[PDB]
């Protein structure tokens, strides 16, 4: 009956941002204040709310979105951003109430030869809508010649790998990100607090 936050922050691997992972957290009594005790989070921004004002007011939905991106893209995890991540991978609504936690995962997610197992979407014919997920892999038409499923010049495969190395700089190091969404919809209550 406990709220299992341990699984969301202690995991061995995270999702790729293009195929980002969403987990519903329902039917749970939670303690939220003992999570902020970890002052090792390099990023911690909450929208429509202050970081210590949610122990009595409850909301019906709690989603744990999580993925990995590199240091220079973490700025895009916010309502109203642009860039490959914000527009082609993970987009937050403008009226988004929730929190954005990020921390540097270099000792975990990189290896000496490079760790090319996390991917992102480089190209897309239009921006995502908020919380849309695109897992398709069709050839991207970057020119006036139609690509016709075949790869070639101006006909690119839309997904790339991040190259994560321990000697990379901060803008190029892996950052694990978790977005908590507290939606204002109506349904029987699921999530409690301290």
């Amino acid at each position: 009956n406990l709220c299992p936050f341990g699984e969301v922050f202690n995991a061995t691997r995270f999702a790729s941002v293009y195929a980002w992972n969403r987990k519903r957290i329902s039917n749970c009594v939670a303690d939220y204040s003992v999570l902020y005790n970890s002052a090792s989070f390099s990023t911690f921004k909450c929208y429509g709310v202050s970081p210590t004002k949610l122990n009595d007011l409850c909301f019906t939905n709690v989603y744990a979105d999580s993925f990995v991106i590199r240091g220079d893209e973490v700025r895009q995890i916010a309502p109203g951003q642009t860039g490959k991540i914000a527009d082609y991978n993970y987009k937050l609504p403008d009226d988004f109430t929730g929190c954005v936690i990020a921390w540097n995962s270099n000792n975990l997610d990189s290896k000496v030869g490079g760790n090319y197992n996390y991917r992102y979407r480089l190209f897309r014919k239009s921006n995502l809508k908020p919380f849309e997920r695109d897992i398709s892999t069709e050839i991207y038409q970057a020119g006036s010649k139609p690509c016709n499923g075949v790869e070639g010049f101006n006909c690119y495969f839309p997904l790339q790998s991040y190259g994560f190395q321990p000697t990379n700089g901060v803008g190029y190091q892996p950052y694990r990100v978790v977005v908590l969404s507290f939606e204002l919809l109506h349904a029987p209550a699921t999530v409690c607090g301290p």
Partner: nanobody, 130 residues
Amino acid sequence: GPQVQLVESGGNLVQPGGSLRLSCAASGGTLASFAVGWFRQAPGKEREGVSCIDVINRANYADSVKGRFTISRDSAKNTVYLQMNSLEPEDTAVYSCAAHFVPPGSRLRGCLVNELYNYWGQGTQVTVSS
């Protein structure tokens, strides 16, 4: 996979004037982020690059094969193909695959100007004989 491996398949015994398509499967990352080249070493001779392709999908070829060989990219299968036409007996070699990563600030640079690659395959042998 902790490391990028490259496996070549398709090696066969074929006849002079034959054709053959070699493949280079990859695991560990998106091969569409790596520049890939093909090399051969005939019996007793030194390794030579024959063809390569970069992340913008432009090909380069050696003169011993220019007009006969075609390098091609199938990234839904995470592979690079090498279509070899008009095989003559002197194409008998072990055909190896090789790749290196292209980071974002270098996506326009070309290939077989990187004859040094960080990841190699073991090769699949092609024998051209009567």
